[PDB]
Amino acid sequence: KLLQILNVRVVGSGERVVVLSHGFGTDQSAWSRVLPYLTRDHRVVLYDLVCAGSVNPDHFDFRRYDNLDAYVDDLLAILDALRIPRCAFVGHSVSAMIGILASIRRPDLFAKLVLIGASPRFLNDSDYHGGFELEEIQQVFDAMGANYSAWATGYAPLAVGADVPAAVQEFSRTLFNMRPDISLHVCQTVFKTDLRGVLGMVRAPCVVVQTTRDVSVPASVAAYLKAHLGGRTTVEFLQTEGHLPHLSAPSLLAQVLRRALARY
């Protein structure tokens, strides 16, 4: 059931497998523009997180998906159902956290991680800059609960960051496709997640994709990830602004993805 439930699609050709895992407010269609740069050389696995608007809301279990380990379970179950013992994994935002956790759970399964819009912790801590004070994100959660449409309209251009109207429109499309209570819930789950303690346990090589400015990811986070991840970690600097380079700068991003996924 799982493969149909999370809209799993496998495209491309080859024995080298790459998983593309999207972030909050999008579904797998967010990968559509970078996808042609990968499918000649790779077998590409796409799926929707259970919280995506493109997934039947009937399947969203608030109790089960109260932590990211439940999302990791879905990812591993998909790869097991597809009989894929080794892959590269590209994760955006919450999916970068899912990827880190998954690579610790199953080290031999993930040959390489590519992390986009990525952070081990979005809340500030003493001297650790995550990007948000507790009070800041609580204000966001208040706004999301009070009027989701109004909040979403305001957030979309901030997330896209660069002045790219088409990307703002497209991100807004899938952001509005989410049921507001599910949206709030997944955001809360992300903001109570703290992977700093386990970064040292990762052994997979890792590419961290950094843009010039990300409303949710301070510039210092990439070097922090490089410093504390336990595998070989390279920061790739993308010369463009925003949290969603696969939507707003797919050309810049695809060439980095090509390099990162050429061999693993």
Swiss-Prot record:
How the protein is affected by changing residue 93 to A? Weakens interaction with D53 and attenuates strigolactone-induced degradation of D53
Primary site of residence: cytoplasm
Annotated positions binding substrate: 93, 187, 243
Residues at the catalytic site: 93 (nucleophile), 214, 243
Domain of life here? Eukaryota
Give its localization.
Cytoplasm; Nucleus
Q: What is the tissue localization of expression for this protein?
A: Expressed in the parenchyma cells of the root stele and lateral roots, vascular tissues of vein and leaf sheath, ligule base, auricle base and stem base.
Task: Return the broad EC class.
Answer: hydrolase
Query: What's its EC?
Result: 3.1.-.-
Q: Name one GO molecular function term.
A: hydrolase activity
Q: Cellular component terms, GO, for this chain's entry?
A: cytoplasm; nucleus
Reported impact of residue 243 to A? No effect on strigolactone binding, but decreased enzymatic activity toward strigolactone and loss of interaction with SLR1
An annotated GO BP: secondary shoot formation
Reply yes or no: does the keyword Cytoplasm apply. Answer: yes
Per the similarity annotation, which family is this?
Belongs to the AB hydrolase superfamily.
Q: What does this protein do?
A: Involved in strigolactone (SL) signaling pathway. May function downstream of SL synthesis, as a component of hormone signaling or as an enzyme that participates in the conversion of SL to the bioactive form. Strigolactones are hormones that inhibit tillering and shoot branching through the MAX-dependent pathway, contribute to the regulation of shoot architectural response to phosphate-limiting conditions and function as rhizosphere signal that stimulates hyphal branching of arbuscular mycorrhizal fungi and trigger seed germination of root parasitic weeds.
Q: How does it assemble?
A: Interacts with D53. The interaction between D53 and D14 is enhanced in the presence of strigolactones. The interaction with D53 occurs in the presence of (2'R) stereoisomers of strigolactones, but not (2'S) stereoisomers. Interacts with SLR1 in a strigolactone-dependent manner. Interacts with D3 in a strigolactone-dependent manner.
Q: What is this protein called?
A: Strigolactone esterase D14
**Organism whose genome encodes this protein:** Oryza sativa subsp. japonica (Rice)
This protein's gene is called D14
State which stretch of the full-length protein is shown: 55 to 318 of 318
